[PDB]
Design a protein around this ligand. Structure first.
Ligand SMILES: Nc1ncnc2c1ncn2[C@@H]1O[C@H](COP(=O)(O)OP(=O)(O)O)[C@@H](O)[C@H]1O
Ligand SMILES: Nc1ncnc2c1ncn2[C@@H]1O[C@H](COP(=O)(O)OP(=O)(O)O)[C@@H](O)[C@H]1O
Ligand SMILES: [Ca+2]
Ligand SMILES: [Ca+2]
Ligand SMILES: [Ca+2]
Ligand SMILES: [Ca+2]
Ligand SMILES: [Ca+2]
Ligand SMILES: [Ca+2]
Ligand SMILES: [Ca+2]
Ligand SMILES: [Ca+2]
Ligand SMILES: [Ca+2]
Lengths: 371, 221, 371
C-alpha cells in the first residue's frame, strides 16, 4: 500500500502521497464560520468552510487559524481540516493508508498525544508517525547535523540539531513570517495610493509579494538607489488592465525579517535569532552548525536572502569561522519532501506506530519513537 | 566500508570510483561520512542522512556523522580514500516526479470537453453527457458544451439549443465544482462573443496553469 | 402501471401560465382577471353566473366589474384567486388536482402570510398531493442556465430586479417598479390617439396590444431615433386593422417602450429599469457585483421588444465604472422563461424530495412551506 504525508503548516496544509516529489494538495489551513448565523437559514449555507472555499467566502464568514503560530489550538477545526485533506483533497480513506504528520518545534506532549488519539479514533489510520518539521528539512538537505531556519506563514523558527536530535534549550521561536509580511506589504502599498478592498484585491497583494519582492543586500544603498533612480522599479498588472508600479516596497517588505521594528515588533531579526540559537548550543558543535545552515519554508524563497543572511551572520560570528548557508531550490516544501522520502524508506517502516500498539499502551507510545 | 546509495538500500562498492549524480556512505567505526554529489537528487541526499542516523543509533550513539558536500572534502576525509577520482554518471532515483497545482489531480490532468444534447433522450433525468474531442471541430450549434479545465469550468451555449440543454450544461458544471475540492468557477459563454472559449480549445487539451515552481526529481544526465 | 405527472402554474400579474411538467410550453395562458355582474338585477333568473374568469370575463365586460386578483404580483383577493385557480385546474387544464403535485410561483418579496395562504388553499381546497412554491425570477435565471445573476422580470403589471446568489434571492436588494406591459399598452393607446386614430373600446385595446407586440421596439439612442423618425420615413410602418384598413405609425413604435427607461412618460415619478437594475446591484455585497454585472438575465413578456438588450447594456455601462464587464442576457424563450424553468424543475428526479406532501401539511400546518 501507499502511505500518506501531511505537513500541518501554520498557514497552509501540504499533503500528498509517500513517494511523490511534491505535495499534491496544498490549501489554506483556515476554517470559517458564518458571522451572522441568519445565513445558515434563509441563504442556505453549511456550518463551516475550509481552505479555498472559506477564503473565497470571506466577508460572510469569520476565519480562524487552527494552527496559528504553529501549534494546534482548536481540535474541531483541525478535524474539519484533516477530514477535508483525506476525503476531499486526497480522495482516499485514511483507514487504508498510514499517515505521517508533522509538528512544530516545542510541541506539547499533550498536543501530540491528542493528535495521535484523533488520528486513530476518528480516522482509523492503520499506522502513523509524527515528525518534527525542521528535522525532515535537515535530513532532506542531505545532512544530519545543522541549524535550520524555518520561516513559514505565521511563525518562524530557528532549530539546531546534532546527529538527528533537536536541542530544545536552544530552539528559537519568532512570531513573524509570511503572513505578517503580506500585511505589511499591503499597508505600505496603501500608503502610496493603491487600495485593496475586494477579496480579489487582497489576494493580489500575496501575489505581488511572491512574484516581485526580493531581499536587499545592504538596505541603505538599495533604499538610496530607489530614491535617486527608477532602475529598481517593476510593474504588476492587475486583472482590470490597470498597472501598478512598485519600487522600494519590493525590498522593504522582506526586510522586516531582519528589522521587525518595521511592523512595531520589539524583537530580533532572523540573523540575530540564528546567532542567539547557535551560541545557546554546546560549545564544541557551534562550528559544525555555522558550516551547515539550512533554510526551509515558504518565506525563505525571496531571491538574494541567502546572501543577506550570510552577511549579517558573518558580521555576527568570530572572524575565523567557515560559514555556509544552505538554500536548496526545493526548500519551500522540504519538510513535506522529507516525509515523502522517509515514509517510503525501508529503514523507516520499523518506526511506524501501529493501531495494535496504540490499543496496548495508550497514546503515550508516540513519545517512545526515534526518527 | 563503502556503499553507493540505491533506492534506500546500500550497495557495497570497494573501488572508490566516485560519481557526481549520486551519494555514497563511507563507514569508519567512530565517524560516518556521507558524500552528496553536486548533481544528484534529493532522495539520494536524504537517504544518506537517514542511513547514517540508523547506523549511529545501532552504535550505542557515540559515533560522529560528518556530512560533506562535493568539492568541499576535508583532508581528514580525503586521506581515507586516496593514496581526485570523481566520475560523471548516476545510480537511479526512487521518486516519481510529479508537477502540482491548486487541485491534486494536476500532473495527470487533461482538460475535457463534454457535449449535452436532449435530441436523443426524453426528459432531463434521462439525459447524459458525452465526452467529445477537445477541439473547436467538435462544436455544433444545435446543442451545448462544457469544458472542464481543472482550474476553471467554461460553458458554451449554442444559439440553436434549447432550455433543457443549457440546464444540463449548468447542472454538469456545478457538479464538477461540487466533486472537486477548492472552487472551480463556472463561466458561461454565449455563441457569438465566445472568444475566450474557443481560445481555450486553442490552448489544447494538455494546457494547465500552476504557478508553483516545478522541480525535477532526477540527476541532470 | 406508470408513475405521476406534475403541474406548473405561474400566477402572473396579468396572465396565468399553466401546463404540465416536461412540456416545453404552458398549455393554458389566460387573463388573470375575475369579473362579477354590474348589479344584482342580472343574476336573478340565473340567468347569469356568480362570476366569470379570464377570456370570458374580457368577453363580457360592461355587465361585469372586472378585477385583477394579482394586480401587482402579490395576491390581494383570495376569493377571486380561488376562481382563477379553479378555472386553471378544471376548465383550461382539465385535470383533477387531487391527482397531481402542483408547483406554484410567487412574486419576489411575497409576504410569508401570503404564501401560507396560498398553501392552505391548495391543500384544503384542491387536496393537492404535493405542492411547491418557487420564486418567479429564480425559475427564470435557472432557465437561463444559471444559479447566480440578477434578473430583470418585466411582465404585465409589475417589474422587478432580483439579484440571486447560489440560487437564493437577496430580498434587501430587490427592486420593484409598478410599471409594465399593460401601462405600455395604455400609453401606446394614448399616443396613437394623438395621431388621429382613436382607441377607447376594449376591442381597440386588443388591437393596440397587437400593434405594440408586433411593431414596437426599444431605441438604442432615443434622441437620435426621434430625429431620424422626424426627418424621414425610415422608421414608419403600416398595420392593417381587422376591417382591412391600414394605418401608419412612426415614432410611436419606440416611444411606447421608451417608458421603461423614462417612467415620467406615464406620469410616474420613478426611475427606469436601467437605473433600478443598477440600484439593486449596488445594494449587494461588493464581492458579488462583478458576477451580477456579468450575468444579467431578462425574463418576462415586456422584455421582448427588440434591441432592449443593447439599450440596457449602454445605460448600465454609463452607470457602472469604466472597467466592469457588463453582459445582458435575453434568452429567446423569455416570454415564458419563468414557466419553463418551473417545468424543468418539476421534471427533475433530484427535485421530488422537496415536494411538500399532504401528510406533512396535516402534521405541521402551512408554515412548512418556508422549508
Ligand atoms: N517566492 C516566494 N517569496 C516569498 N514568499 C513566498 C514565496 N512563495 C510562497 N511564499 C510564502 O510562504 C508562506 C508559506 O510558507 P509555508 O511553507 O506554507 O509555511 P507554513 O507551512 O508553516 O504555513 C506564505 O506566506 C507564502 O506567501
Ligand atoms: N413580443 C412582445 N412585445 C411586447 N410586449 C409583449 C410581447 N409579448 C408579450 N408581451 C407582453 O407581455 C405581457 C405579459 O408578460 P408576462 O411575463 O406574461 O407577465 P405576467 O407574469 O405579469 O403575466 C403582456 O402585457 C404582453 O403585452
Ligand atoms: Ca512549515
Ligand atoms: Ca553520537
Ligand atoms: Ca542519481
Ligand atoms: Ca439540440
Ligand atoms: Ca445536436
Ligand atoms: Ca469545489
Ligand atoms: Ca516535480
Ligand atoms: Ca411573471
Ligand atoms: Ca386562452
Amino acid at each position: 500500500t501507499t502511505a500518506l504525508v501531511c505537513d500541518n503548516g501554520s498557514g497552509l496544509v501540504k499533503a500528498g502521497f509517500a513517494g511523490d516529489d511534491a505535495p499534491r494538495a496544498v490549501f489554506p489551513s483556515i476554517v470559517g464560520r458564518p458571522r451572522h448565523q441568519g445565513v445558515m437559514v434563509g441563504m442556505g449555507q453549511k456550518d463551516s468552510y475550509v481552505g479555498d472555499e472559506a477564503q473565497s467566502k470571506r466577508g460572510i464568514l469569520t476565519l480562524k487559524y487552527p494552527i496559528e503560530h504553529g501549534i494546534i489550538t482548536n481540535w474541531d477545526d483541525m478535524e474539519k481540516i484533516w477530514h477535508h485533506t483525506f476525503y476531499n483533497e486526497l480522495r482516499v480513506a485514511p483507514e487504508e493508508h498510514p499517515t505521517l504528520l508533522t509538528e512544530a518545534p516545542l510541541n506539547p506532549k499533550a498536543n501530540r498525544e491528542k493528535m495521535t488519539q484523533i488520528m486513530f479514533e476518528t480516522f482509523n489510520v492503520p499506522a502513523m508517525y509524527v515528525a518534527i518539521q525542521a528535522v525532515l528539512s535537515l535530513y532532506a538537505s542531505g545532512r544530519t547535523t545543522g541549524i535550520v531556519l524555518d520561516s513559514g506563514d505565521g511563525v518562524t523558527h530557528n532549530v539546531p540539531i546534532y546527529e538527528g536530535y533537536a536541542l530544545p534549550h536552544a530552539i528559537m521561536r519568532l512570531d513573524l513570517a509570511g503572513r505578517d509580511l503580506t500585511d505589511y506589504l499591503m499597508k505600505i502599498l496603501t500608503e502610496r495610493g493603491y487600495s485593496f478592498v475586494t477579496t480579489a484585491e487582497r489576494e493580489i497583494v500575496r501575489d505581488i509579494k511572491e512574484k516581485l519582492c526580493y531581499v536587499a543586500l545592504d538596505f541603505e544603498n538599495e533604499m538610496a538607489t530607489a530614491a535617486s533612480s527608477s532602475s529598481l522599479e517593476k510593474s504588476y498588472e492587475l486583472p482590470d488592465g490597470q498597472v501598478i508600479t512598485i519600487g522600494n516596497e519590493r525590498f522593504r517588505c522582506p526586510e522586516t525579517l531582519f528589522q521587525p521594528s518595521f511592523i512595531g515588533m520589539e524583537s530580533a531579526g532572523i540573523h540575530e535569532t540564528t546567532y542567539n540559537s547557535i551560541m545557546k548550543c554546546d560549545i564544541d558543535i557551534r562550528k559544525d552548525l555555522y558550516a551547515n545552515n539550512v533554510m526551509s519554508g515558504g518565506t525563505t524563497m525571496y531571491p538574494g536572502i541567502a546572501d543577506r543572511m550570510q552577511k549579517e551572520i558573518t558580521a555576527l560570528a568570530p572572524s575565523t569561522m567557515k560559514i555556509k548557508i544552505i538554500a536548496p531550490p526545493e526548500r519551500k516544501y522540504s519538510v513535506w519532501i522529507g516525509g515523502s522520502i522517509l515514509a517510503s524508506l525501508s529503514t523507516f517502516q520499523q518506526m511506524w506506530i501501529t493501531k495494535q500498539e496504540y490499543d496496548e499502551a495508550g497514546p503515550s507510545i508516540v513519545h517512545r519513537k526515534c526518527f | 566500508k563503502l556503499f553507493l546509495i540505491v533506492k534506500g538500500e546500500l550497495k557495497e562498492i570497494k573501488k572508490n570510483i566516485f560519481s557526481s549524480g549520486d551519494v555514497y556512505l563511507l563507514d569508519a567505526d567512530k565517524t560516518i561520512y556521507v558524500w552528496i554529489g553536486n548533481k544528484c537528487s534529493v532522495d539520494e541526499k536524504t537517504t544518506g542522512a537517514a542511513q547514517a542516523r540508523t547506523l549511529d543509533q545501532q552504535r550505542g550513539g557515540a559515533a560522529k556523522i560528518i556530512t560533506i558536500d562535493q568539492g568541499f572534502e576535508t583532508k581528514d576525509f580525503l586521506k581515507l580514500i586516496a593514496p581526485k577520482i570523481v566520475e560523471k554518471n548516476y545510480a537511479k532515483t526512487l521518486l516519481v516526479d510529479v508537477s502540482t497545482g491548486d487541485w491534486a489531480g494536476f500532473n495527470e490532468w487533461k482538460n475535457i470537453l463534454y457535449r449535452a444534447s436532449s435530441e436523443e433522450f426524453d426528459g432531463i433525468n434521462s439525459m447524459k453527457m458525452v465526452q467529445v474531442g477537445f477541439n473547436k471541430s467538435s462544436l455544433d450549434s444545435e446543442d451545448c458544451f462544457v469544458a472542464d479545465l481543472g482550474n476553471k469550468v467554461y460553458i458554451w451555449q449554442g444559439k440553436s439549443s434549447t432550455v433543457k440543454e443549457r440546464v444540463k450544461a449548468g447542472q454538469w458544471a456545478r457538479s464538477i465544482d461540487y466533486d472537486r475540492a477548492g472552487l472551480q468557477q463556472e463561466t458561461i459563454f454565449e455563441e457569438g462573443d465566445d472568444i475566450e472559449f474557443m481560445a481555450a480549445l486553442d490552448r489544447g487539451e494538455n494546457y494547465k496553469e500552476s504557478d508553483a515552481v516545478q522541480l525535477k526529481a532526477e540527476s541532470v544526465l
